[PDB]
Amino acid sequence: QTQPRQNFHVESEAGINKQINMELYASYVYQSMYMYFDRDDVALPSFAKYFKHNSEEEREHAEKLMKYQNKRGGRIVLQDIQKPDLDEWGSPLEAMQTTLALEKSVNQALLDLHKIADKHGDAQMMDFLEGEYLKEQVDAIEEISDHITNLKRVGTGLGEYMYDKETM
Amino acid sequence: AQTQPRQNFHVESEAGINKQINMELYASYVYQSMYMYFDRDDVALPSFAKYFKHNSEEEREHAEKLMKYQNKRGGRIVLQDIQKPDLDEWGSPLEAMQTTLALEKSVNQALLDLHKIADKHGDAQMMDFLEGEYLKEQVDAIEEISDHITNLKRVGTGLGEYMYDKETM
Amino acid sequence: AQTQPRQNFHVESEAGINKQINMELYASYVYQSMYMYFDRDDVALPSFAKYFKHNSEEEREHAEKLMKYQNKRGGRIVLQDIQKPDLDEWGSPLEAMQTTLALEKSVNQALLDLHKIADKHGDAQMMDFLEGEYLKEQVDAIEEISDHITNLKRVGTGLGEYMYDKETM
Amino acid sequence: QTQPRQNFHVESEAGINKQINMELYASYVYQSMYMYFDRDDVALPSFAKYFKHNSEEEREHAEKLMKYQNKRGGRIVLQDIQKPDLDEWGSPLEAMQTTLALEKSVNQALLDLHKIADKHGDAQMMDFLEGEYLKEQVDAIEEISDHITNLKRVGTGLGEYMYDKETM
Ligand SMILES: [Cu+2]
Ligand SMILES: [Cu+2]
Ligand SMILES: [Cu+2]
Ligand SMILES: [Cu+2]
Ligand SMILES: [Cu+2]
Ligand SMILES: [Cu+2]
Ligand SMILES: [Cu+2]
Ligand SMILES: [Cu+2]
Ligand code: NA
Ligand code: NA
Ligand code: NA
Ligand code: NA
Ligand code: NA
Ligand code: NA
Ligand code: NA
Ligand code: NA
Ligand code: NA
Ligand code: NA
Ligand code: NA
Ligand code: NA
Ligand code: NA
Ligand code: NA
Ligand code: NA
Ligand code: NA
Ligand code: NA
Ligand code: NA
Ligand code: NA
Ligand code: NA
Ligand code: NA
Ligand code: NA
Ligand code: NA
Ligand code: NA
Ligand code: NA
Ligand code: NA
Ligand code: NA
Ligand code: NA
Ligand code: NA
Ligand code: NA
Ligand code: NA
Ligand code: NA
Ligand code: NA
Ligand code: NA
């Protein structure tokens, strides 16, 4: 056993490794969206900036899970980061709808990881996940939902441009 | 049997103040409902939300100032149920402002009727308190909501609703 | 038919939050009644008044934070009548604090029952939100009111009530 | 007619002169109370300070009515300022009860003066009285009422001394 290890099940350790890969994947998706809105034929720099920031924070979320794995005495096992499903992401509205589905899948995987901690009595891991991950996912899902509603309200064309200049 | 401060303060004015207190609290509740309606994920107009949040707190403060006045004159505060608002959801920004205009006018008419009670009982100090602290602000509020309605008709639905939120609200 | 944010959020938790919202608003109304009772000319304890004024605004803010949470998770806020408090007047500072202790404990028990609803439906995020944002403060509030009751029994009526107002309150 | 005079009835002018005398009288009463609490055998310096301030403000209330009389074109006619009814004022509680009755009589006389302005259509005088006199009398009567309630609560002896040090 590694020196720190106490009340830390191998199933939780494996679940953290798989969550690490999913955060890195989400980071890659947002990096793709960032560079898509930076295209000369899309050219929405504040949408670009938004996905750049989201890409950096998903990757920080990954690192915080990596730090946690080491803190509890787990061992980090990295896997390929899959490329995103698409090369281009359509309208600002479609990109946000794609983002909502992504954040919800990440949230479901965090809830499943919390279930692993719960069944093995890992009280500290449950609280770590609730405070550091579940709370932010709820805020992020709300924020993307508001974006989708406003993008439907303002419509295509001028409205997409104004939303970029104002909210984003 | 009169309270220590009481002078030139009729029981009908005291009762009228208690009724006005409930109506300010009711209006506060209406605005707090509108605040949270515009905070919904499928409405999501954060500056309309903040406007009704502020309106809800001013109405609650208007209620408290009436409560303080009741005590100052030697009246006794008698609280009643605060009815829930008529609707759970308030439609478009335009419809919500139209609902607000009718509410503020209803509150104004009840303030004017309360002023009439003070007047017929010779309560000079209460008339002036109402004029300076309530009637003046109701006239400003009714004007402001009217301007909002006109601009919301001008900008129309969709992008205009969003721009009004970012600019005026 | 689900709202955009909704995930792992049961209708029973949503209903429980709406019920807790009404109970926080009710407690706010109770404290606002106590605030204005201590502001009466024949009670006239201005620091007890300010204490319940602040308590009334925190309860109203606790209600709003629950309303915001309901929207965040994709629930729909359904408001109900805010019942008037049981009494119009609250007796001595000691009796008012004893009334407050029972109220805060009632609110705490309803928060614990709301936590049980989240727990049985596996709502990990809602349990933590309740623990950090509501249960922790209810425990601090219940302790603080208990200290007030003990000191009010120690100082007794008359001068002691006045000194407690000037010093601790 | 004096140069400024417009819509200013002789009955209002006379009523202001009589209100002037009543404010000066109230000022004299409070000056007596001030010096009574300054006695070596009473010795409550914050009660003394309170009645000193009230004496100064009654006399400022008198001067503001004198200024108003001149503003409207009335002529100030002064009368004897009667000495107060008593030379000594008993307990802090009794002095406050005496003060409440005094402020209420002054308030009733202001309301009667407002009636004179009303029946002669003197809109400006009514508003002057409401804003500058009636509002303050209501605040003063409330404040004295609170004092009486607290003086009954704290009782005689130590309570009188503590009230002097704390509220007064
Ligand atoms: Cu993440
Ligand atoms: Cu837990
Ligand atoms: Cu926890
Ligand atoms: Cu109002
Ligand atoms: Cu609470
Ligand atoms: Cu005066
Ligand atoms: Cu008038
Ligand atoms: Cu006026
Ligand atoms: Na296992
Ligand atoms: Na597993
Ligand atoms: Na690209
Ligand atoms: Na760019
Ligand atoms: Na590795
Ligand atoms: Na959609
Ligand atoms: Na769980
Ligand atoms: Na959020
Ligand atoms: Na947003
Ligand atoms: Na919107
Ligand atoms: Na009547
Ligand atoms: Na009536
Ligand atoms: Na709502
Ligand atoms: Na509702
Ligand atoms: Na409602
Ligand atoms: Na209209
Ligand atoms: Na009305
Ligand atoms: Na159920
Ligand atoms: Na239930
Ligand atoms: Na009261
Ligand atoms: Na009541
Ligand atoms: Na009550
Ligand atoms: Na007890
Ligand atoms: Na309960
Ligand atoms: Na005459
Ligand atoms: Na006369
Ligand atoms: Na003397
Ligand atoms: Na002295
Ligand atoms: Na003279
Ligand atoms: Na008395
Ligand atoms: Na009059
Ligand atoms: Na006052
Ligand atoms: Na006082
Ligand atoms: Na008192």
Residue numbers in the entry:
A (entry chain B), D (entry chain B): 3 to 170
B (entry chain A), C (entry chain A): 2 to 170
Copied sentences from the primary study:
Ferritin represents a ubiquitous class of nanocage-like proteins that are primarily involved in maintaining iron homeostasis. Accordingly, ferritin plays a central role in taking up iron (as Fe2+) and storing it in a stable and unreactive form (as Fe3+-oxide/hydroxide). The crystal structure revealed that TgFer presented a typically 4–3–2 symmetry in a cage-like, spherical shell composed of 24 identical subunits, featuring highly conserved organization in both the ferroxidase center and the 3-fold channel. Each of TgFer subunits is characterized by a four-α-helix bundle containing two antiparallel helix pairs (A, B and C, D) and a fifth short E-helix that forms an angle of approx. 60° with respect to the four-helical bundle.
In TgFer + Cu, the ferroxidase binding site appeared to be occupied by one Cu2+ ion (90% occupancy) because no peaks corresponding to an Fe2+ ion were identified at this site, based on an anomalous difference Fourier map. By contrast, we also observed that merely one copper ion (Cu-1) was present at site A of the ferroxidase site in TgFer + Cu and TgFer + CuFe. In the TgFer + Cu structure, two Cu2+ ions are found in the 3-fold channel. The Cu2+ ion (Cu-2) is located practically outside the channel bridged with three water molecules, and the intermetallic distance Cu-2–Cu-3 in the sites is 3.74 ± 0.23 Å. The other Cu2+ ion (Cu-3) is located deep inside the channel, coordinated with the OD1 from Asp129 residue (distance of 2.71 ± 0.22 Å) and the OE2 from Glu132 residue (distance of 2.64 ± 0.36 Å) from the 3-fold symmetrical subunits. The occupancies for Cu-2 and Cu-3 in these sites have been estimated to 80 and 90%. The metal ions at these sites were confirmed as being Cu2+ ions by an anomalous difference electron density map. Cu2+ ions have been demonstrated to display special coordination properties, such as the ability of Cu2+ ion to coordinate strongly with the imidazole nitrogens, and Cu2+ ion has been characterized as an inhibitor of the catalyzed reactions between Fe2+ ion and dioxygen in ferritin. Thus, these results lead us to propose that copper binding to the ferroxidase site can potentially block iron binding to inhibit the ferroxidase activity in TgFer. Thus, it can be concluded that Cu2+ ion binding at 3-fold channel may affect the function of iron uptake in the structure of TgFer. On the one side, since the crystals of TgFer + Cu suffered severe cracking after long exposure times to the salt, we set the soaking time to 5 min.
